[PDB]
């Protein structure tokens, strides 16, 4: 009875390839050729502000909430015979523009003879960005068969999420309107609480000290929808992220070492830990995502991503998706079941020097995140 979201770590053939424009492939072939990780969930709508509204995250699992990325929404369009809805009635908006009509395109692949009528839109925002679909009438929702979302993170890893209509994972995404409390100034502000529930054995450490664990990772999106004030035709809707911080406390970090232990050297720091994530993968790929920021107000986000095959030719050796990872180096030792992370740092220690690194290794069913706190400056 697994009705939650699920994810697979794909072993894409061309890791250099990305989403090519214009759209030339069916949704399935797009996933197969540009996604290193896919997340399957339901496509649900909600009648709001005179139109059925669906809210989808550009990145389901927030590896780096502040990192910028390039997202692409590609949905499948087909209205049933008894539905007289025009392509011009579907509107979308994201982190960049107001509600508008997306561009449509018909793609054909003589390989299998398939043909699809797609609608697409391009976005550029942080991993916390959103994409909102709106279709009119009570039957518009039936025209959207499925919605793919490709998100090329800073590390160059393709993080996709497919939201099919009538998907068996009906509990992976639950959305329910909430009161806005007049938090925003948007005219006719309507707040939505989208809960994302994924079946994944997740553990979060700080160095080698456990911080949290569970059999399901939940994320709650509190979003305000409305319109900007105007002065005396088009109804251009926008959204505003709402941060509900009263719920949580900082107890997990209360006991983490101020400076995560590690092997300090001249130009790098090395962290070792024991992990069974590669043994539980059971011949499945592992997506390793590491990123670090040595800055406060702002500093260059160093991000990297690898896909580790857990059996076969070239066994248990990281395969690179980006051009190359200078700031970070990662190697796995199967004999000891230990992982070693290397961070390039500046050879001079000093006061006020605080850096942060985050390594998230995840398979289809397991997920480990490890936070490292440095007293040096990241490259």
């Amino acid at each position: 009875s697994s009705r939650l979201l699920t994810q697979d770590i794909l072993f894409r053939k061309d890791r250099q390839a990305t989403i090519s424009l214009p759209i030339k492939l069916p949704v399935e072939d797009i996933i197969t050729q540009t996604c290193d990780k896919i997340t399957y969930g339901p496509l649900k709508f909600l009648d709001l502000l005179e139109k059925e509204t669906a809210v989808l995250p550009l990145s389901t699992d927030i590896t780096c909430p502040a990192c910028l990325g390039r997202a692409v929404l590609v949905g499948k369009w087909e209205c049933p015979a008894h539905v007289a809805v025009n392509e011009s009635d579907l509107t979308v908006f994201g982190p960049n523009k107001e509600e508008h009509v997306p561009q449509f395109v018909t793609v054909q692949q003589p390989s299998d003879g398939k043909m699809q009528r797609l609608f697409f839109a391009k976005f550029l925002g942080t991993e916390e960005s959103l994409a909102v679909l709106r279709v009119p009438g009570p039957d518009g929702h039936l025209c959207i068969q499925e919605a793919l979302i490709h998100f090329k993170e800073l590390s160059g890893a393709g993080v996709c999420s497919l939201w099919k209509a009538n998907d068996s994972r009906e509990e992976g995404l639950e959305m329910k309107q909430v009161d806005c409390l007049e938090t925003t100034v948007l005219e006719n502000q309507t707040c939505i609480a989208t809960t994302l529930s994924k079946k994944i054995y997740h553990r979060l450490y700080c160095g080698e000290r456990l911080m949290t664990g569970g059999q399901v990772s939940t994320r709650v999106l509190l979003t305000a929808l409305g319109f900007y004030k105007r002065q005396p035709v088009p109804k251009g809707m926008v959204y505003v992220h709402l941060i509900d911080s009263g719920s949580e406390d900082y107890m997990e970090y209360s006991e983490c070492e101020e400076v995560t232990p590690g092997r300090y050297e001249d130009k790098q720091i090395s962290y070792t830990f024991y992990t069974d994530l590669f043994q539980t993968a059971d011949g499945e790929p592992v997506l390793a995502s590491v990123w670090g920021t040595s800055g406060l107000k702002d500093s260059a986000y160093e991000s990297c991503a690898f896909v580790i095959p857990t059996d076969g030719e070239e066994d248990l050796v990281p395969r690179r998706i980006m051009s190359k990872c200078y700031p970070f180096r990662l190697t796995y030792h199967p004999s000891t079941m230990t992982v070693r992370l290397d961070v390039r740092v500046e050879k001079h220690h000093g006061a006020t020097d605080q850096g942060f690194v985050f390594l998230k290794m995840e398979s289809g069913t397991y997920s480990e995140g490890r936070e490292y706190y440095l007293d040096r400056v990241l490259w």
């Binding site: 007049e182 938090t183 925003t184 505003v240 709402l242 941060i243 920021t293 942060f356 706190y373």
Partner: protein, 62 residues
């Protein structure tokens, strides 16, 4: 400045955890403060509280 609004404020936390801050957008009805932590996460706090202003003035001192 990043566009975000505070739906609810957070409890006070030790100064040694806050690394940055910035005021909320003009789209938000209520003026709130968004602290950035050494974990690179955002935390909303009520600007009308004393400990917030102490964290703010001390943050700009560095």
């Amino acid at each position: 400045t990043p566009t975000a609004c505070c739906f609810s404020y957070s409890r006070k936390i030790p100064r040694q955890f806050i690394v940055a801050y910035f005021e909320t957008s003009s789209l938000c009805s209520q003026p709130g403060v968004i602290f950035l932590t050494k974990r690179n996460r955002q935390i909303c706090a009520d600007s009308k509280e004393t400990w917030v202003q102490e964290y703010i003035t001390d943050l700009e001192l560095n």
